[PDB]
Amino acid sequence: KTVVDGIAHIHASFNNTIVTITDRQGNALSWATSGGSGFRGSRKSTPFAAQVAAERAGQAALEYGLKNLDVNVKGPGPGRESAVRALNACGYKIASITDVTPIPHNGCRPPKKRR
Amino acid sequence: RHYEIVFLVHPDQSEQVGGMVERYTKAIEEDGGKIHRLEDWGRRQLAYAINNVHKAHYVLMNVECSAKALAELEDNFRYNDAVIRNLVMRRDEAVTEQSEMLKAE
Amino acid sequence: LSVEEKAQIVNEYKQAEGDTGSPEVQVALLSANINKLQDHFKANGKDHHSRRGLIRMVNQRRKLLDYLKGKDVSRYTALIGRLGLR
Amino acid sequence: KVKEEPFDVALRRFKRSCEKAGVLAEVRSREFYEKPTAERKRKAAAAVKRHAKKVQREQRRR
Amino acid sequence: IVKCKPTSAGRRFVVKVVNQELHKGAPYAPLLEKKSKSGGRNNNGRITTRHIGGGHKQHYRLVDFRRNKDGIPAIVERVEYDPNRTAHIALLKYADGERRYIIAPKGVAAGDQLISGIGAPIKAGNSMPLRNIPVGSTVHGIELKPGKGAQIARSAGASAQLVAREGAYVTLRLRSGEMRKVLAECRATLGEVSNSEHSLRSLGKAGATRWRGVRPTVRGVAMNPVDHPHGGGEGRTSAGRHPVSPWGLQTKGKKTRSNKRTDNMIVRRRK
Amino acid sequence: FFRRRKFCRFTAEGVKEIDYKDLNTLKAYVSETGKIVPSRITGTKAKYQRQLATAIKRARYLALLPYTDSH
RNA sequence: CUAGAGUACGGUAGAGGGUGGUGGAAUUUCCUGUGUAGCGGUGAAAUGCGUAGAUAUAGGAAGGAACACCAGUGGCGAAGGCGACCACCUGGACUGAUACUGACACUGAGGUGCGAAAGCGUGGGGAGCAAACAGGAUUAGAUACCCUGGUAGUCCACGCCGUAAACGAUGUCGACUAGCCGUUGGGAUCCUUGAGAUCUUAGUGGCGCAGCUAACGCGAUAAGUCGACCGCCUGGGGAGU
Ligand SMILES: [Mg+2]
Ligand SMILES: [Mg+2]
Ligand SMILES: [Mg+2]
Ligand SMILES: [Mg+2]
Ligand SMILES: [Mg+2]
Ligand SMILES: [Mg+2]
Ligand SMILES: [Mg+2]
Ligand SMILES: [Mg+2]
Numbered sequence: 001k002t003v004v005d006g007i008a009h010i011h012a013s014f015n016n017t018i019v020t021i022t023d024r025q026g027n028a029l030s031w032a033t034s035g036g037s038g039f040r041g042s043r044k045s046t047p048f049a050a051q052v053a054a055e056r057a058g059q060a061a062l063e064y065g066l067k068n069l070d071v072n073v074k075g076p077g078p079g080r081e082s083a084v085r086a087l088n089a090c091g092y093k094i095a096s097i098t099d100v101t102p103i104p105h106n107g108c109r110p111p112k113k114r115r
Numbered sequence: 116r117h118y119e120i121v122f123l124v125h126p127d128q129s130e131q132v133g134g135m136v137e138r139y140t141k142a143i144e145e146d147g148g149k150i151h152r153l154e155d156w157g158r159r160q161l162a163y164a165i166n167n168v169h170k171a172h173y174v175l176m177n178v179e180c181s182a183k184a185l186a187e188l189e190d191n192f193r194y195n196d197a198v199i200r201n202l203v204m205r206r207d208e209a210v211t212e213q214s215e216m217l218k219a220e
Numbered sequence: 221l222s223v224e225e226k227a228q229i230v231n232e233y234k235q236a237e238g239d240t241g242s243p244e245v246q247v248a249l250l251s252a253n254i255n256k257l258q259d260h261f262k263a264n265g266k267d268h269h270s271r272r273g274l275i276r277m278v279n280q281r282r283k284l285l286d287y288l289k290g291k292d293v294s295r296y297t298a299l300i301g302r303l304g305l306r
Numbered sequence: 307k308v309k310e311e312p313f314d315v316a317l318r319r320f321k322r323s324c325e326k327a328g329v330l331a332e333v334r335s336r337e338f339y340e341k342p343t344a345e346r347k348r349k350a351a352a353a354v355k356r357h358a359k360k361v362q363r364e365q366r367r368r
Numbered sequence: 369i370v371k372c373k374p375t376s377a378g379r380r381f382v383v384k385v386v387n388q389e390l391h392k393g394a395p396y397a398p399l400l401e402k403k404s405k406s407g408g409r410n411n412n413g414r415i416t417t418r419h420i421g422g423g424h425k426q427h428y429r430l431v432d433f434r435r436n437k438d439g440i441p442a443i444v445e446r447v448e449y450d451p452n453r454t455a456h457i458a459l460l461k462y463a464d465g466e467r468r469y470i471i472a473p474k475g476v477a478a479g480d481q482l483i484s485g486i487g488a489p490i491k492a493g494n495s496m497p498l499r500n501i502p503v504g505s506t507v508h509g510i511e512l513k514p515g516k517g518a519q520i521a522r523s524a525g526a527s528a529q530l531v532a533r534e535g536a537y538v539t540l541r542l543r544s545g546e547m548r549k550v551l552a553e554c555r556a557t558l559g560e561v562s563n564s565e566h567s568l569r570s571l572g573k574a575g576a577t578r579w580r581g582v583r584p585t586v587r588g589v590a591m592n593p594v595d596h597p598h599g600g601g602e603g604r605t606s607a608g609r610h611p612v613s614p615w616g617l618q619t620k621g622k623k624t625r626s627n628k629r630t631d632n633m634i635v636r637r638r639k
Numbered sequence: 640f641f642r643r644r645k646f647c648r649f650t651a652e653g654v655k656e657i658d659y660k661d662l663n664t665l666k667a668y669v670s671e672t673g674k675i676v677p678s679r680i681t682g683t684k685a686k687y688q689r690q691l692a693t694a695i696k697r698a699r700y701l702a703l704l705p706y707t708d709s710h
Numbered sequence: 711c712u713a714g715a716g717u718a719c720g721g722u723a724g725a726g727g728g729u730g731g732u733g734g735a736a737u738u739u740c741c742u743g744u745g746u747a748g749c750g751g752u753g754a755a756a757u758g759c760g761u762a763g764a765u766a767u768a769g770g771a772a773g774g775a776a777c778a779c780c781a782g783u784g785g786c787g788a789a790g791g792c793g794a795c796c797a798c799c800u801g802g803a804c805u806g807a808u809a810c811u812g813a814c815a816c817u818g819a820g821g822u823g824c825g826a827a828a829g830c831g832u833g834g835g836g837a838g839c840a841a842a843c844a845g846g847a848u849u850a851g852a853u854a855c856c857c858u859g860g861u862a863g864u865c866c867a868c869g870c871c872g873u874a875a876a877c878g879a880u881g882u883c884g885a886c887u888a889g890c891c892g893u894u895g896g897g898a899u900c901c902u903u904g905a906g907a908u909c910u911u912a913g914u915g916g917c918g919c920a921g922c923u924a925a926c927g928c929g930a931u932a933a934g935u936c937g938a939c940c941g942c943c944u945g946g947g948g949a950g951u
Contacts, residue, residue: 531771531772532771532772541772547772567832567833568832568833636740
């Protein structure tokens with residue numbers, strides 16, 4: 001199976017970073033997370049774990065080619081930009097970087113404040 | 116009085132809008148409301164998807180009619196599949212023609 | 221209240237003046253507005269903010285009627301019997 | 307949204323564009339519901355700090 | 369709706385639903401026929417549906433449900449009380465005679481409507497096929513087969529919502545909350561059934577139910593083991609068995625649908 | 640003085656009764672993402688800021704301008 | 711008699727009210743395709759959710775509420791309070807010229823209304839949040855702070871409730887008393903290009919002299935100088951019992 005010009009989705013929470021490689025149809029091809037790299041704690045939230053997960057996801061994506069990528073960054077947490085620098089290191093031409101973020105206009109009220 | 120009803124129809128129904136304009140304005144004339152402009156902006160692309168479409172056909176119209184024709188047009192657009200959006204307005208003044216389509220081309 | 225409705229009341233209860241100052245005109249306009257607003261609050265029962273304005277007009281009307289009684293009684297009676305009050 | 311041309315220039319243009327457009331502090335202001343009292347506290351404090359700055363700069367502009 | 373003063377012990381909690389729009393007697397005689405009170409007894413004479421007995425003499429009203437007359441405008445004469453329903457019925461008059469009874473919508477006091485096809489899609493009470501109506505509308509009196517007559521949403525205050533249209537079926541959500549597909553060529557009536565105030569009522573006394581036709585119901589724990597599965601005991605027994613019908617069917621939470629023919633027409637179960 | 644000339648703007652010309660149709664003028668007061676710009680950046684008067692916001696919202700309802708980059 | 715107060719005529723600015731319709735971001739639930747080992751969470755962990763195919767990703771359906779940016783010491787309202795757009799009714803305030811009523815005014819014990827939030831009665835609605843409650847962790851102990859779930863309630867229709875740090879901790883109305891720097895909206899003079907200049911009202915902010923204060927600190931939106939009326943206080947507990 002050969003597919004080119006995929007889309008890279010990056011979901012970066014305050015405690016984890018999830019990287020998924022898809023196509024224009026939004027079909028999963030390769031996914032990797034910071035927890036699977038073996039951090040599981042304060043080390044899991046660091047942006048270095050997002051680089052390890054990103055470059056691991058960028059190795060199984062070569063099974064189908066994907067010489068061109070479109071990066072969609074998502075989330076406020078760390079590794080928002082560090083994971084992107086770990087993508088082209090694997091040898092991918094990144095065409096565009098796009099900010100996708102759920103911003104409620106008013107939306108549902110968020111949880112209570114911590115103390 | 117002095118409404119500025121703006122509505123846009125389905126792109127597939129843009130061919131039939133010529134008869135629909137007269138069909139709606141005849142009721143306004145029967146009610147006793149004169150029409151000061153009738154502009155068809157043409158086919159343009161929407162900024163977002165409305166029921167999974169991207170083209171439309173905007174129809175600008177300004178009317179001076181009583182409450183009966185207002186209710187007639189308020190109900191006609193609701194019970195139509197061609198008309199996908201509408202916006203009835205009110206201005207306390209008269210109407211002048213050829214507002215901006217000359218500049219829009 | 222429309223401009224023409226105010227003008228009709230002014231022309232009706234004109235005190236041979238051509239002017240809109242007299243209590244016979246002010247109370248007449250307030251009564252005409254009060255009667256018009258009766259159907260509004262039967263539809264909108266919870267419109268309390270607009271309810272405050274009607275009481276202001278009613279109080280002003282009762283003050284003007286008291287002032288008119290304080291000066292003349294024939295004029296007071298000719299207006300009460302003509303507008304159907306008390 | 308940022309297109310592409312070295313990659314570091316695109317990274318910096320993405321970081322600066324995201325900060326200028328927003329949608330990064332707003333997310334941080336969506337993790338806990340501030341009551342309208344706390345929201346009016348922001349409006350009072352920011353107004354005090356902004357109006358005070360306009361007078362403090364006049365001292366430098368003497 | 370009114371409230372009764374505690375003049376006697378039976379009037380303390382009587383909540384009546386009074387109306388001044390109803391006509392004072394004299395129903396249209398040609399559309400009335402006698403009806404006998406079954407008493408819950410079939411042709412064999414055995415009591416099938418218990419807790420039925422007594423009541424008051426009633427005349428059945430030939431309530432029109434098909435609304436087959438298409439195109440002819442109709443004018444309401446009056447709204448009358450129906451003994452054998454919870455809703456009110458309206459007497460119609462078409463352009464040439466032919467007075468009929470229909471389930472009265474919330475429209476009252478001599479309204480005019482045209483039960484027809486694609487005509488008059490606005491006013492409530494207009495009967496028309498389900499294909500040519502907008503989605504999201506509220507309808508009542510929905511027939512399940514062409515020409516059968518209105519079947520669903522006929523009680524007082526009942527209605528159903530249109531939610532989708534595809535192919536020959538038009539899905540709608542019933543008042544029970546059960547999604548269901550119905551054929552597109554089936555007619556239905558826009559609006560809501562009239563007597564929405566029926567839920568706000570208290571019969572007040574024991575005798576108030578006896579002229580409704582309902583006979584008193586006796587619990588299973590107050591019986592002997594021969595009579596009911598719950599049976600007797602010493603003192604007020606706690607019904608040691610699981611809750612059960614007199615004939616041995618689980619009562620508290622057991623499905624009892626075994627149709628297996630119309631299940632394809634049900635999209636989502638009520639839950 | 641870019642903010643200063645913008646109050647003129649709307650104020651110097653007889654365009655007090657602005658409309659929701661002039662997309663060429665409305666697009667100048669909308670950021671790249673789609674959100675409407677503030678008044679301290681453009682320097683427009685508060686009356687015309689409020690008048691311009693309603694026109695932006697009407698054009699948004701008529702799908703003449705976008706809301707966000709998502710669509 | 712017109713200086714207080716009020717009526718008639720233009721024109722503005724407004725999240726001022728109530729009855730309906732319509733929007734798009736986002737959350738959750740359900741169905742379908744790809745895909746495979748974790749996801750979620752925390753000082754750090756655990757409970758919990760996962761190969762019965764989760765998280766993530768793409769397409770579709772239903773439903774509820776809130777209404778990013780605009781947005782400000784910004785605006786309106788007697789107060790409470792009021793932020794999407796549109797139609798319907800609807801109150802009041804603002805600025806201009808002219809005409810009139812000619813003290814018709816202020817306050818207000820009893821009484822009559824409008825009452826944030828919570829709460830209660832009947833009927834609907836059930837997205838998120840979250841009293842109570844369950845579990846995990848911390849803890850000598852933890853009913854709590856922390857985390858995973860979660861009911862009433864929060865929403866709509868009618869009625870009741872009369873309480874809040876219901877705050878400007880300052881009752882209402884009228885008049886005089888140096889100034890400077892903003893801003894909301896309405897008109898005047900002004901060379902005329904103004905990124906214009908000055909004065910004057912109706913609000914809303916920051917300094918500040920005379921005066922006041924126990925001091926803090928107010929200072930034309932006085933807590934300065936004076937007038938009309940009402941309410942209220944008389945050591946702290948006991949006790950707004
Ligand atoms: Mg007979
Ligand atoms: Mg029974
Ligand atoms: Mg019983
Ligand atoms: Mg016994
Ligand atoms: Mg015995
Ligand atoms: Mg037995
Ligand atoms: Mg108190
Ligand atoms: Mg106090």
